[PDB]
Amino acid sequence: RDVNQLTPRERDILKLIAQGLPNKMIARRLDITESTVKVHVKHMLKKMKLKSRVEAAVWVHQERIF
């Protein structure tokens, strides 16, 4: 639904995804295993009902909210 509905943690993964870092680079940056990144991304996929990260990223950048 809405990107602001996410938790601060989920906001962090979301912003890292929108910044173009790949999943393992996200794991490196936050010093966590790939499993937690997979858990976060799969919950984002389920809640946002989306197929890929790119669509969410482009929708985030569309309105130029920042």
Partner DNA sequence: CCGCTGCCGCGAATTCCGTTTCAGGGTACGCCTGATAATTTGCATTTTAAATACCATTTATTGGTTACT
Binding site for DNA (CB under 7 A): 22-24, 34, 37-39, 41-42, 45-46, 51-53
Nearer of residues 4 and 52 to DNA, judged by Cβ: 52
Nearer of residues 17 and 63 to DNA, judged by Cβ: 17
User: Packing angle between helix 53-62 and helix 8-18, nearest 10 degrees?
Assistant: 90
Nearer of residues 33 and 63 to DNA, judged by Cβ: 33
C-alpha span between 61 and 12 (Å, rounded): 16
How many Å separate Cα 14 from the centre of its chain? Answer: 3
Rounded least distance, CB 6 to DNA, Å: 16
Rounded least distance, CB 3 to DNA, Å: 18
C-alpha span between 46 and 65 (Å, rounded): 24
